[PDB]
Amino acid sequence: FQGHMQVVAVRVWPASSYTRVTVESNRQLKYKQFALSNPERVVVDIEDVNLNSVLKGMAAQIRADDPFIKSARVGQFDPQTVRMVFELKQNVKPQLFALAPVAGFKERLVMDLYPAPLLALLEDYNSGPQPGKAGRDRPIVIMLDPGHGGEDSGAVGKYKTREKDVVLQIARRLRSLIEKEGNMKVYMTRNEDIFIPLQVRVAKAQKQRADLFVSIHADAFTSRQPSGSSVFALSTKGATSTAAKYLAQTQNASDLIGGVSDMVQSLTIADSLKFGKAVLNKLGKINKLHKNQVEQAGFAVLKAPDIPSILVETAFISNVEEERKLKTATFQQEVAESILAGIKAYFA
């Protein structure tokens, strides 16, 4: 019970591109943010707040490896006003924005501390395949996109496994395999627990000249019965099943969850279907398939107009058996070997 409090939760997401501080509360917060020096500090003042257990716990959320925050102290500064003080490891350009309650979160105040390669993309948030035959004239450029991150945990298992962790571990195994393919070059939209907006993932792939885009997930249905792996490609004109339409809806809410402030396209979909099929065939040796064909729905991460893009449901984490499989090194590796083998079989 937290009806009485103003601030109800406080989270810090340390990452190399930016550290995010989130303060969640029952009413929209009036705040002021400013800087101090000797030592470099960022200070946030919050109004209509009484200090409590939650804000007092803010100091113990600061990890010894936050690239931005050396430490955080909090006090009542005024009978109305809490002051948060962040001692810094490097110069920052803070950006603060407020979010209305949505997706199960109450009011959120977000502060992102940026420094004063993916930085370039987040800060201008206000190309495509190179010429030649990928694989033969130059390497195939693959962009891996592990779903979610930071504030957005993704779907959560019955036994508490978070989709964000497992799709990252699976992306890392797959990255590691690819960097033994002489044929191949790999980038990642993220390689840590950070939140990346949906359009930034897409833009990263256009920016780094991807030949293939794979988005990796472990989503959830309300029922714990549906299980197995599955592969999706884009449709802008209607989903091929209610399951696919639903996952498009849940996956597109990511930007709300984590929090932020057309002749050539049909041809790209056709290639994506063909690449999706190759990948499905390899997942079918390794796992139950949820559906036996490649499906389509309005997935925002698959909107890159010039790049074949697919979304791989490694498995539905809503399912108890598949939650447990997703935690295992063997099954994560089988999934990684399957995507790779599918990539190779597409180029032949």
Burial 30-54 (b: 16+ CB within 10 A, else e): ebeeeeeeeeebbebbbeebebbeb
Nearer to Na ion, 123 or 181 (CB): 181
Residues in the chain: 348
Report the nearest approach of Na ion to the CB of residue 142 (Å). Answer: 9
Q: Which stretch binds Zn ion (CB under 5 A): 21-29, 92-100, 135-143, 215-223?
A: 215-223
Residue 219, binding choice from Zn ion, Na ion, none, Cβ under 5 to 8 Å by partner class: Zn ion
Residue 271, binding choice from Na ion, Zn ion, none, Cβ under 5 to 8 Å by partner class: none
Nearer to Zn ion, 205 or 220 (CB): 220
Nearer to Na ion, 105 or 347 (CB): 347
Does 217 help bind Zn ion (rule: CB under 5 A)?
yes
Nearer to Zn ion, 69 or 312 (CB): 312
CB-CB contact of 229 with 217 (8 Å): no
Residues that bind Na ion (CB under 5 A): 179, 181, 184
Q: Phi first, then psi: what are they for 60, rounded to 5°?
A: -95, -5
Residue 321, binding choice from Na ion, Zn ion, none, Cβ under 5 to 8 Å by partner class: none
Residue 179, binding choice from Zn ion, Na ion, none, Cβ under 5 to 8 Å by partner class: Na ion
Does 219 help bind Zn ion (rule: CB under 5 A)?
yes
Residue 214, binding choice from Zn ion, Na ion, none, Cβ under 5 to 8 Å by partner class: none
**Of residues 306, 301, 299, the one with CA closest to residue 211:** 306
Report the nearest approach of Na ion to the CB of residue 241 (Å). Answer: 35
For residue 318, give the DSSP letter.
T
Does 147 help bind Zn ion (rule: CB under 5 A)?
yes
Long-range Cβ contacts of 185-191 (<8 Å, 24+ apart): 185/139, 185/140, 185/141, 185/142, 186/141, 186/142, 186/143, 186/144, 187/141, 187/142, 187/143, 187/144, 188/143, 188/144, 188/145, 188/146, 189/118, 189/143, 189/144, 189/145, 189/146, 190/145, 190/146, 190/149
Does 201 help bind Zn ion (rule: CB under 5 A)?
no
Report the nearest approach of Zn ion to the CB of residue 98 (Å). Answer: 26
Sign for the CA dihedral angle at 274, 309, 175, 141 comes to positive
Does 290 help bind Zn ion (rule: CB under 5 A)?
no
Which helix (H) or strand (E) segment holds residue 78: the answer is strand 69-78
Q: Which stretch binds Zn ion (CB under 5 A): 2-10, 108-116, 219-227, 330-338?
A: 219-227
Report the nearest approach of Zn ion to the CB of residue 188 (Å). Answer: 16
Report the nearest approach of Na ion to the CB of residue 311 (Å). Answer: 23
Report the nearest approach of Na ion to the CB of residue 182 (Å). Answer: 6
Number of residues engaging Zn ion in binding (CB under 5 A): 4
Nearer to Na ion, 108 or 185 (CB): 185
Nearer to Zn ion, 13 or 68 (CB): 13
**Of residues 50, 48, 51, 55, the one with CA closest to residue 23:** 55
Report the nearest approach of Na ion to the CB of residue 185 (Å). Answer: 6
Nearer to Na ion, 181 or 255 (CB): 181
**Side-chain half-sphere of 276: how many Cα atoms within 13 Å?**
28
Report the nearest approach of Na ion to the CB of residue 184 (Å). Answer: 4
DSSP string, 40-66: TEEEEEEES----HHHHGGGGG--TT-
Distance (Å, rounded) from C-alpha 162 to C-alpha 153? 6
Distance (Å, rounded) from C-alpha 67 to C-alpha 89? 7
* Residues near Zn ion (CB under 5 A): 147, 154, 217, 219
